[PDB]
């Protein structure tokens, strides 16, 4: 499937969206920008 998810982009220095398939992958994978940023934002 095509889920709108968030990941921390090192070259942007902030979280950014990406399409997630729904299974597998890694943990740089967040359902909201806010949750992404609380884990990765500083």
């Amino acid at each position: 499937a095509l889920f709108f998810r968030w990941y921390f982009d090192v070259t942007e220095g902030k979280c950014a969206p990406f399409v997630y398939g729904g299974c597998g992958g890694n943990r740089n994978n967040f359902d909201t920008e806010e949750y992404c940023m609380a884990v990765c934002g500083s």
Binding site: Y7, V19, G21, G22, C23, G24, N26, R27, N28, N29
Partner: peptide, 13 residues
């Protein structure tokens, strides 16, 4: 360290 990993669409894409 998880924050430096590449975005992975995974195999259900």
């Amino acid at each position: 360290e998880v924050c430096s990993e590449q975005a992975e669409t995974g195999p259900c894409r």
